[PDB]
Design a protein around this nucleic acid. Structure first.
Ligand SMILES: [Mg+2]
Ligand SMILES: [Mg+2]
Ligand SMILES: [Mg+2]
Ligand SMILES: [Mg+2]
Ligand SMILES: [Mg+2]
Ligand SMILES: [Mg+2]
Ligand SMILES: [Mg+2]
Ligand SMILES: [Mg+2]
Ligand SMILES: [Mg+2]
Ligand SMILES: [Mg+2]
Ligand SMILES: [Mg+2]
Ligand SMILES: [Mg+2]
Ligand SMILES: [Mg+2]
Ligand SMILES: [Mg+2]
Ligand SMILES: [Mg+2]
Ligand SMILES: [Mg+2]
Ligand SMILES: [Mg+2]
Ligand SMILES: [Mg+2]
Ligand SMILES: [Mg+2]
Ligand SMILES: [Mg+2]
Ligand SMILES: [Mg+2]
Ligand SMILES: [Mg+2]
Ligand SMILES: [Mg+2]
Ligand SMILES: [Mg+2]
Ligand SMILES: [Mg+2]
Ligand SMILES: [Mg+2]
Ligand SMILES: [Mg+2]
Ligand SMILES: [Mg+2]
Ligand SMILES: [Mg+2]
Ligand SMILES: [Mg+2]
Ligand SMILES: [Mg+2]
Ligand SMILES: [Zn+2]
Lengths: 81, 87, 144, 129, 155, 150
RNA sequence: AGGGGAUCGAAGAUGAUCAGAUACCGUCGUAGUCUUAACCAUAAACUAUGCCGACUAGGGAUCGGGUGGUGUUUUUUUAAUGACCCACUCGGCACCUUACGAGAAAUCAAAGUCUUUGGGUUCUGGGGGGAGUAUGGUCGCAAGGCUGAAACUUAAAGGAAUUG
RNA sequence: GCGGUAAUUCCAGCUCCAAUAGCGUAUAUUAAAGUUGUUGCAGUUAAAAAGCUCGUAGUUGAACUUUGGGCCCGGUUGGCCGGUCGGAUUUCCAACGGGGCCUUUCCUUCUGGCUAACCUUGAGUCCUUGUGGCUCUUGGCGAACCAGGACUUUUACUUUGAAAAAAUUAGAGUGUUCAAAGCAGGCGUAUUGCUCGAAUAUAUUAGCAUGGAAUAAUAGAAUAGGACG
RNA sequence: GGAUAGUGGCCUACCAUGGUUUCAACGGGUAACGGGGAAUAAGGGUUCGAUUCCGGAGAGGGAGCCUGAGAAACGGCUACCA
């Protein structure tokens, strides 16, 4: 306050701000790869579903949508990238 | 404030606030001058030697006199950390 | 910006809008409605010269108490009847009924002057002389 | 909605100085904003400023010293003819010895004395003292 | 405007003093006269190719173009062989040091060597009085359509 | 913000600074340009496609991994609809409000809500028709609109 | 114009009270009060405070959305949930303290960034009374609504605060 | 606001004030008036935000497209000397402008008329040890504009200039004895004429002519009916 | 085509349905001739110009016309009204 660095703000208090109020705006949502050991391969899912995503071959389930990040179904794993 | 040929006219060049570079003028009686004396080997605060700062009554009223003093002193080297340029 | 349009092309709105609000000015309105020429006992003229009908003592307004001694006058270019005050102690003995007086305004812009209610004018000359001269001594009222 | 991007810049800069700060983040910059900030800085009324690149219209971090009483934008850009620059400076400048009206000529964004030297005229952007 | 017949009127439409001798057999039928108006306006090919008469044409007609050359945008094509254009401009009002949008409408004769559509910018040039109103004649079409064939149907 | 109410809300996508990439996404331009068409061939809207390819598939934004927005890609393959998608969904809306209004003449709130929708249709259309996507003299009329949408 | 017409209740009639008492109080009770079809278009329809945008300052609650947690409470066998707790973030209805600042003040996070006077735009006012009167137009079944003067008069009328 | 019995406002006397060959009154208008508010008003409670939203005309409207670098040319003040018999220009110098280059860079375009300019150089040299300096024709600049052909997205702004009545106004010169004025007048050999004048400025909105390319519009290529040749 | 000194709905004949307008048409008021200019001095403005120069209009009101290079003349004529 009264003097500070607006060009190099702390990574802690940039982390709490709204995605549009950061210094250069960008998304907070991520993509993930999901598996359900019935199936060998892995679909890539957006963290925020809308559509309830079904896997490659079998109609199973993956996530139901929410007002937000999708709840993943039951036994599943995920990596992030 | 010079004149036609060279001569300094217009009495009394005022002080300036150390934080804001804004004039401190006669009737500001909320202003301040903080005298910080220099030290020497093994204690010993050395009378008659100072590093001085002048803070306008504006800044003091706005509650910034403290945090603004840290930046000022630490940049002159009489504080080590306490102040962070980033937030 | 509170109101007035600041754009570079808003001149038309700016003069239209000012043209409108000039009508709240009392003088601009009076001068364009021609109230001078339309209403008012004088034509808009500086003075006007009528004929004395009766002589009135006017009862002065509060908190004064007096009798103001005016004359009912019928303007010669008009026929408009007008009551007009006769200043300066005496000077009611200077007029007479059917005498020919020249009246001026009171210097209030219409608007009756003093404790005198309704009187917007004053006598200046009688029988072509000027009450002033008669009131002091400098002149005498003509024969008839 | 934003009617002058220059406007919100100059205003925010003035609310920095008035509130006693040393820096301000302005949005969303512009070509006109930059050449305005340059004319100030080249007479010293602000310090160094940094265009940051969002993939949008931009942002600027201006460092200001406190020599600056006011910067402001004349919001309709009036046309000035070479002899009416006298009347503009006279109206909004604190005194004849300093401070500038900065305007837009076909010779580019430049302050009024540079305009007087180069003898070009144009519309009027703003002023700085 | 015109459009066909060429010969439809109670009087025979011809060019003055342009004679074609019926004795001398000619493969063009009628001999046709024209000129260049000047000032750089290309006398368009539809005037030299054309069969229309129009003694008010600046190329094939008896009018000279001199005085003002103006441009306006075509606001009306209704009356025969003449149009009305609107010319906008801003008027400076000094007290407010600002402008207001104004316009005038200039009636102008247009030879049927130009096909004028409403919306076209058109270069027009001055004239001896052609009619009660028309003081100008259409000398160039600077517009075209403004995306006429871009008005067509779906995919 | 919010032309037709006083709601000031800020909600929107924050688009990444990276204008290429992910680099963890592999596939190809070829890969998803078919993936677009196959869904438009099913009848999906370009928004429904971008949403669908965002979740089941790895398409961050179709516009990065292919040089074109989803609607140009549909247009080029001859998939574009008669009216744009946003205009359609406005008209589709007004149609149902109206049908509701004829069934209830006592609902003054619907009348007001109908006016709004229609006024958005009329301004949007005026723009689309200015920019040549809709022919001039294209007009929305409630008499003919229920056929337009269905 | 139909219906409905329990309640309360302009009008009217009464019992009181009063010098009087056309009232206040008590009684009776028409219209009305409710509904359908259609008018009317007005309220101190008030935040007596146009709308869009930007900037300027702290604080604890709270409504809605979301995010984070080896949080609490729920037992079953851990969970899953749900309700709760704590931190942050949008977007609300408000309060609190500040006053850099504004104001004639009362007060005001706008009523601030205004003689250092220009972001965009709509509207209304120009002393009081005459008077929202006259007149014309217009809308209405009507009651009335919108538009809306002048002659003349007048030195105040008025706002906030102070002491009596 | 004074006058109802000691009237600082009336009627007089004395004395005094302001302006003075003039001074008062009436009417109008202008300044005072930021009470008409473009500059520049005000609208919670003093006059004043339409009960509310929609909405046409009107006004207004985010950001982005040659930026940066290198060299050349010659101007006008000002500094330190002055060479000189108050003003002079070269070298030293900063400063501020103008022109033109080359950096991927239409300059409308060919078809020659033209060349003023060097990549030239043909000789060498006035002269400070030589790129300080220009005369000078035999291979080698286009734009400086002639004129013919063929074509050209529209504007706003701003610069300079032309076309321009006089009197008025601003203003220079001139001692109408001063002055308002006037455009006169001033010099000898006043016996035989000599001589400076009779400026300059404003003159805008529109039209015309020229330079600028920031600001702000406008048009362009998507069913390719694109651009080049 | 007629008429004009001559262009032109100037007029006539035939033909068409056009022309202006909220960027205020049309209509009304003007105690309105227009201009060069005048008054008021921070600037911006406000107000005024019958009137010594320029232009236009008129000769009690209207119309008509002879003469003439030139007048729809009035210190010319003819008629009607006053
Ligand atoms: Mg009023
Ligand atoms: Mg009487
Ligand atoms: Mg008479
Ligand atoms: Mg026709
Ligand atoms: Mg918003
Ligand atoms: Mg809106
Ligand atoms: Mg509200
Ligand atoms: Mg009763
Ligand atoms: Mg009783
Ligand atoms: Mg009682
Ligand atoms: Mg009301
Ligand atoms: Mg939990
Ligand atoms: Mg009194
Ligand atoms: Mg006595
Ligand atoms: Mg006395
Ligand atoms: Mg201005
Ligand atoms: Mg006021
Ligand atoms: Mg009020
Ligand atoms: Mg813009
Ligand atoms: Mg040429
Ligand atoms: Mg004809
Ligand atoms: Mg007259
Ligand atoms: Mg006049
Ligand atoms: Mg005159
Ligand atoms: Mg006038
Ligand atoms: Mg007269
Ligand atoms: Mg007479
Ligand atoms: Mg008559
Ligand atoms: Mg005559
Ligand atoms: Mg005579
Ligand atoms: Mg005569
Ligand atoms: Zn599966």
């Amino acid at each position: 306050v009264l003097v500070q660095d607006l060009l190099h703000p702390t990574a802690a208090s940039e982390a709490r701000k709204h995605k549009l109020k950061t210094l250069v705006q960008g998304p907070r949502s991520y993509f993930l790869d999901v598996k359900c050991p019935g199936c060998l391969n892995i679909t890539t899912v957006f963290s925020h579903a809308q559509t309830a995503v079904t896997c490659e071959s079998c109609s199973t389930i993956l996530c139901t949508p929410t007002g937000g990040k999708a709840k993943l179904s039951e036994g599943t794993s995920f990596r992030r990238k | 404030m010079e004149n036609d040929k060279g001569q300094l006219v217009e009495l009394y060049v005022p002080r300036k606030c150390s934080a804001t570079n804004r004039i401190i003028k006669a009737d500001d009686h909320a202003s301040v001058q903080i005298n910080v004396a220099k030290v020497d080997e093994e204690g010993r605060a050395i009378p008659g030697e100072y590093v001085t700062y002048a803070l306008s009554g504006y800044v003091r009223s706005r509650g910034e006199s403290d945090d603004s003093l840290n930046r000022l002193a630490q940049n002159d080297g009489l504080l080590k950390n306490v102040w962070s340029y980033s937030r | 910006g509170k109101g007035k349009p600041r754009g570079l092309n808003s001149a038309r709105k700016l003069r239209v809008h000012r043209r409108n609000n000039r009508w709240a000015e009392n003088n601009y309105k009076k001068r364009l409605l021609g109230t001078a020429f339309k209403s008012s006992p004088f034509g808009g003229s500086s003075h006007a010269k009528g004929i004395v009908l009766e002589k009135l003592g006017i009862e002065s307004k509060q908190p004064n108490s007096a009798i103001r001694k005016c004359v009912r006058v019928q303007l010669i270019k008009n026929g408009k009847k007008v009551t007009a005050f006769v200043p300066n102690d005496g000077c009611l003995n200077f007029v007479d009924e059917n005498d020919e007086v020249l009246l001026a305004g009171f210097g209030r812009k219409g608007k009756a002057k003093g404790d005198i209610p309704g009187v917007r004018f004053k006598v200046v000359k009688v029988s072509g002389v000027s009450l002033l001269a008669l009131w002091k001594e400098k002149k005498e009222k003509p024969r008839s | 909605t934003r009617s002058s991007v220059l406007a919100d810049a100059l205003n925010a800069i003035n609310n920095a100085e008035k509130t006693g700060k040393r820096q301000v983040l302005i949005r969303p910059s512009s070509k006109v904003i930059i050449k305005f900030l340059q004319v100030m800085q080249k007479h010293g009324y602000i310090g160094e400023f940094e265009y940051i690149d969002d993939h949008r219209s931009g942002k600027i971090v201006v460092q200001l010293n406190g020599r600056l009483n006011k910067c402001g934008v004349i919001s309709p850009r009036f046309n000035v003819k070479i002899g009416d620059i006298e009347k503009w400076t006279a109206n909004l400048l604190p005194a004849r010895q300093f401070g500038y009206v900065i305007l837009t000529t076909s010779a580019g964004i430049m302050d009024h004395e540079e305009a007087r030297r180069k003898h070009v005229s144009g519309k009027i952007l703003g002023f700085v003292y | 405007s015109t459009e066909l017949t060429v010969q439809s009127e109670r009087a025979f439409q011809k060019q003055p003093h342009i004679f074609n001798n019926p004795k001398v057999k000619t493969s063009k039928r009628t001999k046709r006269w024209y000129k260049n108006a000047g000032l750089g306006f290309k006398t368009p090919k539809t005037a030299i190719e054309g069969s229309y008469i129009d003694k008010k044409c600046p190329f094939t007609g008896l009018v000279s173009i001199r005085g003002k050359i103006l441009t306006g945008t075509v606001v009306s094509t209704k009356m025969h062989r003449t149009i009305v254009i609107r010319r906008a401009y801003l008027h400076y009002i000094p007290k407010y040091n600002r402008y207001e949008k104004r316009h005038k409408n200039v009636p102008v004769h247009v030879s049927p060597a130009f096909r004028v559509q409403v919306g076209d910018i058109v270069t027009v040039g001055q004239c001896r009085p052609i009619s009660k109103t028309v003081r100008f004649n259409v000398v160039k079409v600077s517009a075209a359509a403004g995306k006429a064939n871009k008005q067509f149907a779906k995919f | 913000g919010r032309m037709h109410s006083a709601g000031k809300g800020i909600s929107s996508s924050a688009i990444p600074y990276s204008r290429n990439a992910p680099a963890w996404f592999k596939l190809s331009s070829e890969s998803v340009i078919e993936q677009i068409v196959k869904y438009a061939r099913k009848g999906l809207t370009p928004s429904q496609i971008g949403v669908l390819l965002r979740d089941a598939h790895g398409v961050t934004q179709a516009r990065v991994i292919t040089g074109n927005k989803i609607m140009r890609i549909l247009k080029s393959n001859g998939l574009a609809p008669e009216i744009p998608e946003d205009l359609y969904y406005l008209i589709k809306k007004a149609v149902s409000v109206r049908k509701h209004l004829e069934r209830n003449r006592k609902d003054k709130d619907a009348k007001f809500r109908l006016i709004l929708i229609e006024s958005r249709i009329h301004r949007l259309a005026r723009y689309y028709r200015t920019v040549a996507v809709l022919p001039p003299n294209w007009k929305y009329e409630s008499a003919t609109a229920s056929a337009l949408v269905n």
